[model samples]
Target: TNYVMTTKNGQTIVTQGKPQLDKETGMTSYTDQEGNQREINSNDVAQLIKADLEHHH
Candidate 1:
Protein backbone atom coordinates (compact mmCIF):
# COMPACT_ATOMS: atom_id res chain seq x y z
CA THR A 1 0.00 0.00 0.00
CA ASN A 2 1.12 3.57 -0.64
CA TYR A 3 1.19 6.25 1.99
CA VAL A 4 1.75 9.96 2.39
CA MET A 5 3.36 11.38 5.49
CA THR A 6 3.68 15.08 6.09
CA THR A 7 5.76 16.77 8.71
CA LYS A 8 4.97 19.79 10.81
CA ASN A 9 7.37 21.82 8.72
CA GLY A 10 5.42 20.89 5.54
CA GLN A 11 7.91 18.32 4.32
CA THR A 12 6.21 15.46 2.49
CA ILE A 13 7.32 11.92 1.83
CA VAL A 14 5.67 9.48 -0.52
CA THR A 15 6.08 5.93 0.55
CA GLN A 16 5.38 3.22 -1.96
CA GLY A 17 5.76 0.47 0.54
CA LYS A 18 3.70 -0.25 3.59
CA PRO A 19 4.78 1.94 6.47
CA GLN A 20 6.19 0.23 9.52
CA LEU A 21 5.86 1.65 12.97
CA ASP A 22 8.14 0.71 15.80
CA LYS A 23 6.33 1.76 18.88
CA GLU A 24 9.22 0.83 21.09
CA THR A 25 11.60 3.10 19.20
CA GLY A 26 8.97 5.64 18.18
CA MET A 27 10.05 5.51 14.55
CA THR A 28 8.30 5.17 11.18
CA SER A 29 9.88 3.63 8.08
CA TYR A 30 9.12 4.31 4.44
CA THR A 31 10.46 3.47 1.00
CA ASP A 32 11.09 6.40 -1.30
CA GLN A 33 10.85 6.57 -5.08
CA GLU A 34 14.49 5.60 -5.38
CA GLY A 35 13.73 2.44 -3.45
CA ASN A 36 15.89 3.62 -0.61
CA GLN A 37 14.59 3.18 2.91
CA ARG A 38 14.08 6.19 5.11
CA GLU A 39 12.91 6.70 8.64
CA ILE A 40 11.49 9.52 10.69
CA ASN A 41 10.81 10.04 14.32
CA SER A 42 7.13 9.68 15.16
CA ASN A 43 7.11 13.13 16.70
CA ASP A 44 8.10 14.71 13.41
CA VAL A 45 5.06 13.45 11.58
CA ALA A 46 2.03 15.69 11.46
CA GLN A 47 -0.16 13.36 9.41
CA LEU A 48 0.02 9.91 7.87
CA ILE A 49 -2.57 8.43 5.57
CA LYS A 50 -2.97 5.59 3.09
CA ALA A 51 -4.55 7.30 0.11
CA ASP A 52 -4.00 8.78 -3.35
CA LEU A 53 -4.49 12.46 -2.52
CA GLU A 54 -0.81 13.26 -2.64
CA HIS A 55 -0.18 10.92 -5.56
CA HIS A 56 -2.87 12.54 -7.68
CA HIS A 57 -1.04 15.81 -7.53
Candidate 2:
Protein backbone atom coordinates (compact mmCIF):
# COMPACT_ATOMS: atom_id res chain seq x y z
CA THR A 1 0.00 0.00 0.00
CA ASN A 2 0.99 3.63 -0.61
CA TYR A 3 0.19 6.58 1.59
CA VAL A 4 0.31 10.35 1.25
CA MET A 5 -0.57 12.32 4.35
CA THR A 6 -0.56 15.94 5.35
CA THR A 7 0.30 16.82 8.88
CA LYS A 8 -1.59 19.26 11.00
CA ASN A 9 1.32 21.64 10.46
CA GLY A 10 0.99 21.37 6.64
CA GLN A 11 3.81 19.01 5.85
CA THR A 12 3.42 16.45 3.09
CA ILE A 13 4.65 12.90 3.58
CA VAL A 14 4.86 10.01 1.22
CA THR A 15 5.14 6.43 2.40
CA GLN A 16 5.52 3.53 0.07
CA GLY A 17 4.99 1.03 2.86
CA LYS A 18 1.62 -0.11 4.04
CA PRO A 19 -0.10 1.93 6.71
CA GLN A 20 -1.79 0.47 9.73
CA LEU A 21 -5.18 1.62 10.91
CA ASP A 22 -6.59 0.74 14.26
CA LYS A 23 -10.32 0.32 14.04
CA GLU A 24 -10.90 0.90 17.71
CA THR A 25 -8.90 4.12 18.00
CA GLY A 26 -9.09 5.45 14.44
CA MET A 27 -5.35 6.09 14.38
CA THR A 28 -3.20 5.55 11.29
CA SER A 29 0.49 4.64 11.19
CA TYR A 30 3.44 4.97 8.83
CA THR A 31 7.24 4.93 8.90
CA ASP A 32 9.40 7.96 8.45
CA GLN A 33 12.77 8.53 6.79
CA GLU A 34 14.44 7.90 10.12
CA GLY A 35 12.73 4.50 10.25
CA ASN A 36 10.58 5.46 13.18
CA GLN A 37 6.91 4.68 13.17
CA ARG A 38 4.52 7.61 13.36
CA GLU A 39 0.93 7.39 14.44
CA ILE A 40 -1.57 10.11 13.65
CA ASN A 41 -5.27 10.57 14.05
CA SER A 42 -7.45 9.85 11.04
CA ASN A 43 -8.69 13.42 10.95
CA ASP A 44 -5.12 14.61 10.42
CA VAL A 45 -4.91 12.96 7.06
CA ALA A 46 -5.49 15.51 4.32
CA GLN A 47 -4.73 13.31 1.32
CA LEU A 48 -4.54 9.58 0.91
CA ILE A 49 -3.49 7.50 -2.05
CA LYS A 50 -6.14 5.21 -3.38
CA ALA A 51 -5.24 1.58 -3.74
CA ASP A 52 -4.30 0.45 -7.21
CA LEU A 53 -5.53 -3.09 -7.59
CA GLU A 54 -5.68 -3.20 -11.38
CA HIS A 55 -1.98 -3.90 -11.59
CA HIS A 56 -2.17 -6.58 -8.94
CA HIS A 57 -4.05 -8.94 -11.21
Candidate 3:
Protein backbone atom coordinates (compact mmCIF):
# COMPACT_ATOMS: atom_id res chain seq x y z
CA THR A 1 0.00 0.00 0.00
CA ASN A 2 1.05 3.57 -0.67
CA TYR A 3 -0.23 6.71 0.95
CA VAL A 4 0.10 9.64 -1.40
CA MET A 5 -1.01 13.11 -0.43
CA THR A 6 -2.44 15.47 -3.01
CA THR A 7 -1.90 18.90 -1.65
CA LYS A 8 -3.78 21.94 -2.90
CA ASN A 9 -0.57 23.12 -4.53
CA GLY A 10 -0.41 20.08 -6.81
CA GLN A 11 2.43 18.66 -4.78
CA THR A 12 2.31 14.99 -3.78
CA ILE A 13 3.38 13.69 -0.41
CA VAL A 14 4.04 9.94 -0.28
CA THR A 15 3.78 8.11 2.99
CA GLN A 16 4.69 4.54 4.01
CA GLY A 17 4.24 1.29 2.08
CA LYS A 18 1.66 -0.81 3.83
CA PRO A 19 -1.39 -1.65 1.63
CA GLN A 20 -4.42 -0.13 0.02
CA LEU A 21 -6.30 -0.73 3.23
CA ASP A 22 -4.98 -1.75 6.59
CA LYS A 23 -6.73 -4.97 7.60
CA GLU A 24 -6.95 -3.55 11.09
CA THR A 25 -7.78 0.09 10.43
CA GLY A 26 -8.69 0.05 6.73
CA MET A 27 -5.97 2.58 5.90
CA THR A 28 -3.48 3.07 3.05
CA SER A 29 0.30 3.67 2.81
CA TYR A 30 3.13 5.44 1.00
CA THR A 31 6.93 5.23 0.83
CA ASP A 32 9.57 7.89 0.62
CA GLN A 33 13.01 8.20 -0.99
CA GLU A 34 14.59 7.62 2.42
CA GLY A 35 12.64 4.36 2.77
CA ASN A 36 10.45 5.92 5.44
CA GLN A 37 6.86 4.85 4.98
CA ARG A 38 3.38 5.82 6.23
CA GLU A 39 -0.10 4.98 4.82
CA ILE A 40 -1.84 5.48 1.48
CA ASN A 41 -4.02 3.81 -1.22
CA SER A 42 -4.58 3.45 -4.99
CA ASN A 43 -6.60 6.62 -5.03
CA ASP A 44 -3.66 8.42 -3.49
CA VAL A 45 -1.05 6.96 -5.80
CA ALA A 46 -3.42 7.36 -8.70
CA GLN A 47 -3.86 11.08 -8.25
CA LEU A 48 -0.10 11.43 -8.12
CA ILE A 49 0.88 9.34 -11.13
CA LYS A 50 -2.38 9.55 -13.04
CA ALA A 51 -1.09 12.10 -15.52
CA ASP A 52 2.09 10.19 -16.31
CA LEU A 53 0.24 6.86 -16.50
CA GLU A 54 -2.62 8.21 -18.55
CA HIS A 55 -0.38 8.19 -21.63
CA HIS A 56 -0.65 4.42 -21.60
CA HIS A 57 -4.42 4.55 -21.55
Name the lDDT of candidate 1.
Answer: 0.83
Q: What is the lDDT of residue 15 in candidate 3?
A: 49
Residues 1-57, candidate 1, lDDT per residue (tens digit)? 687888988998888866788999999888887889988898899988886644553
Off by over 4 Å in 2: 50-57
Candidates arranged by TM-score, highest first: 1, 2, 3
Model with the higher lDDT, candidate 1 or 3: 1
- RMSD of every candidate to native, in Å, equals 3.4, 4.5, 5.9
**Model 3: per-residue Cα lDDT over 1-57, one tens digit each:** 444457444666654443345567545555674787666443444354322223453
lDDT of 2 by residue, 1-57 (tens): 556666676888877676777888989988866678888897787776744656853
The clash count for each model shown is 0, 0, 17
List ranges where model 3 is wrong by over 4 Å. 1-11, 14-19, 40-57
- Single out the weakest 10-residue window by summed lDDT for candidate 2: 48-57
Clashing pairs in 1: none
